[PDB]
Amino acid sequence: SGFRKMAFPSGKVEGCMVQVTCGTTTLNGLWLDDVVYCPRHVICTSEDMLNPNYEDLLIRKSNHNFLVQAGNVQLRVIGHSMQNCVLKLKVDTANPKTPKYKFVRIQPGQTFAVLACYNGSPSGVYQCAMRPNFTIKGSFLNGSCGSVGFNIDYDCVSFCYMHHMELPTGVHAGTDLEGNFYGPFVDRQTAQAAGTDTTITVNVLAWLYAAVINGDRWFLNRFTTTLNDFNLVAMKYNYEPLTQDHVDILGPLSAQTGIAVLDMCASLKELLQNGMNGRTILGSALLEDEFTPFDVVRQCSGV
Amino acid sequence: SGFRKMAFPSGKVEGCMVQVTCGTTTLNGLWLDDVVYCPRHVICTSEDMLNPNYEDLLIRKSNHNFLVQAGNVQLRVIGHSMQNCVLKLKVDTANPKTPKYKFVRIQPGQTFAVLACYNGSPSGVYQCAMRPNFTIKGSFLNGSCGSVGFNIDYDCVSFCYMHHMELPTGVHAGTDLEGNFYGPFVDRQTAQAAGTDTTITVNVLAWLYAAVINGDRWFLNRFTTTLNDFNLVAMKYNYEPLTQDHVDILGPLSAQTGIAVLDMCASLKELLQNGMNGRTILGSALLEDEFTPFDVVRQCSG
Ligand SMILES: *[C@@](O)(CO)[C@H](C[C@@H]1CCNC1=O)NC(=O)[C@H](CC(C)C)NC(=O)c1cc2c(OC)cccc2[nH]1
């Protein structure tokens, strides 16, 4: 038993992390087969980042302008190209530790593991959720760009995020591995705001089921609600709407606890209107929304 | 910026997890050099775990009774021994993925990464804090014994925890890599209770230093205190007493912010006696006690 935010093992990703340097600008790259993926703004200087014409700055660069370091060995760049905001550097050596992998664009509300790296060296790993406003609440410092987010299904690593930016509010923004940003952000040195953040309702419900499976039932109530009436209250409290697909996705958790999804909605409705009154749920004083139904099932099945 | 419960990358430990099976009992082992370490109760039968005499049980075991597998490849056992609650199985193959490592016994309050493992296959990694009552609030299922907790300094892996037991309350207990249980538990199929838990004072102070570093410093007062006066006060609010080592590992943060440790102790004392008065610290009205002074520096420095 027990329930904590838990990331997939990062070993298969650590073996792909490299360092990319152009001028006095350094960040992390991802080395899969004979191509290294990194944020394209590595080709910028301090002055270029204010408003960079990347296509312009890229044609003016030569292969030998890119220093790529895999641990202690230097990889030779034998070609370069740009796909959206991601620079792709072909190299003379294929990474022998390349795992079975795929590039996936994650949906808002879904979770992934983040391997924070600095100077091409892994530093830490933690779970994040792609929030509705397409930011993530991570822990990134200077030099963390190029760090990637991922999940692992059996032995296949699905890469879904590469880090680029920290917003003024302290949250973080990035691209998928095709170089497309999540959210309306742009890779220029400007202060950018995200859209209004909402709470991932299906995740809050799943996390409440995790509390019941771990013995916490104090928030339950005898009342029930309709899907529409719950959504009215949810939208009022800046919660994402709950769809029938979400109700279907919550089925297994409902069958294990014997609590109908719409019964848990009434319990969440009361929590939103009455509050927790100082009480805690699974140790938290706030309603947690960064656990997916999958995340919960994978720690609370059999308990 | 940003504060997360962050775990060390698990790759150096993933390459060391194996599966150990005796009869039908399977759990996880740690393969370092030519030795596999694992919980000794792997030699017990289902009905035998009520009050095992591990010394007699081991007498009835030979090298050929132990099935050690890295993946599906069997590692031949060429010797066996018992050290406290851990079994050391000498194997014929030295693990080529063995990292530079050491065995450490952590103190209550310190944090470490836990690599959840099942049938020798890593499944997840998360960060834990060793409670003052020698328990960790983790996520462990059937088959998780033998999973290890660890820290990584540069390229050295410091192993500090091997999982053994889930308590009736849902928290977990285990040993260091020398087989010595953290806390007053024993490897036996019985419901054992942990001592009443307390708040990790040293970590709360680290958290306050973190708030100061970020410009959130309303709680700094004009008082100071002796270490003894603070301890006696802290024990009345279910807070751990501080040691000399606790004062010492707050040194870097005290020097970074210019706030003497005992001045911050006096600030904490005020918060304990008078509450927060609706105010928040780093966006929360609850004082957090699962980040060590090192975790704070790592996430404010780099
Ligand atoms: C990468 O490491 C750059 O290689 C870096 C990521 C962080 C720095 C601190 N915390 C992080 O996660 N990314 C940046 O510095 C990006 C650069 C590219 C061009 C987008 N810039 C920002 O993240 C950024 C710029 C500004 C800003 O301007 C002026 C004003 C306010 C916030 C801000 N963030």
Ligand SMILES: *[C@@](O)(CO)[C@H](C[C@@H]1CCNC1=O)NC(=O)[C@H](CC(C)C)NC(=O)c1cc2c(OC)cccc2[nH]1
């Ligand atoms: C290991 O996997 C055993 O190999 C297993 C750990 C977990 C199982 C589920 N969640 C875990 O963390 N360990 C045990 O089952 C141990 C075996 C001991 C070391 C011999 N037993 C317990 O942890 C345990 C026993 C009892 C009990 O008795 C009866 C009564 C109440 C709780 C309890 N926990």
